[PDB]
Design a protein around this ligand. Structure first.
Ligand SMILES: Cc1nc2c(cc(C)n2Cc2cnn(C)c2)c(-c2ccc(Cl)cc2)c1[C@H](OC(C)(C)C)C(=O)O
Ligand SMILES: Cc1nc2c(cc(C)n2Cc2cnn(C)c2)c(-c2ccc(Cl)cc2)c1[C@H](OC(C)(C)C)C(=O)O
Lengths: 132, 132
């Protein structure tokens, strides 16, 4: 797919919210644990994603996530326009005992996912570099 | 420089801690606001960085940052071994009025820095892809 398309979804585990961003063309994931599934957390996360990768268009399985003016302001400032969460949840379960906090197990699970094989981490850099 | 070298430093502003990671070869920055300059925040940040980029060796201007066993465990698990903060502080000042929270202004400042021109964001992907 196009190199600037990202998928953004909020999932739940242990009573906390896990925001999962997926680079559609590569399978590359960035994920964070947020306290609440609010528009302010989504806006701030989008600003972070956009500063690290060339984010052009964002998709979601729950359109209502993108309705807050807060989110829309983040998309506006960064120039952003408008399946996988089980694989990551699978990895999280496997490594969960290796960490006290869920946020730590998530980052461990993002590490494993992006580096297993090319790997998602290798694909995204190639796709983005090729487009450059 | 080598494509796996990162610089990690904790800086202060408005009574909060800003952790700044710099990809030495490219000038690419990832930065986060943390509540306290603790070893647990450093360990968790290193796990995040390592899952997104091929981090091989990490440097710092304050060696004592890397002494906690917590940090060393993060480096161990991820396979990690062992100037710019004023430019980012300059950008933060410029955009500070555009946001209520410092954490928002930081991400805005990371966005500006990584995308201004090649740009740091374009260089890092090329360096990492070339090494692949
Ligand atoms: C809460 C915690 N405390 C820790 C570690 C390691 C150590 C020595 N301590 C202190 C300790 C625990 N027991 N004793 C007898 C001493 C870790 C950890 C660091 C790196 C990885 Cl790869 C996995 C876990 C985490 C981890 O949280 C962080 C990443 C710090 C936010 C977690 O969520 O478990
Ligand atoms: C605290 C806040 N509230 C906001 C926005 C936008 C809006 C409509 N609201 C609600 C509002 C403010 N006033 N009124 C009359 C309504 C933002 C913002 C979003 C994107 C960008 Cl690029 C810059 C700021 C931030 C921002 O914080 C976040 C990113 C949400 C954690 C900040 O730190 O300022």
């Amino acid at each position: 797919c196009s190199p600037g398309i990202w998928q953004l979804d909020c999932t739940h585990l242990e009573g906390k919210v896990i925001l999962v961003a997926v680079h559609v063309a590569s399978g590359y994931i960035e994920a964070e644990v947020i306290p609440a599934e609010t528009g302010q957390e989504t806006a701030h996360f989008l600003l972070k994603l956009a500063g690290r990768w060339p984010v052009k268009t964002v998709h979601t399985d729950n359109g209502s996530n993108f309705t807050s003016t807060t989110v829309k302001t983040a998309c506006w400032w960064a120039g952003i326009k408008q399946s996988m969460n089980k694989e990551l949840k699978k990895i999280i379960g496997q490594v969960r005992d290796q960490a006290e906090h869920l946020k730590t197990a998530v980052q461990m699970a993002v590490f494993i996912h992006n580096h297993k094989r090319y790997s998602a981490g290798e694909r995204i850099v190639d796709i983005i570099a090729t487009d450059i």
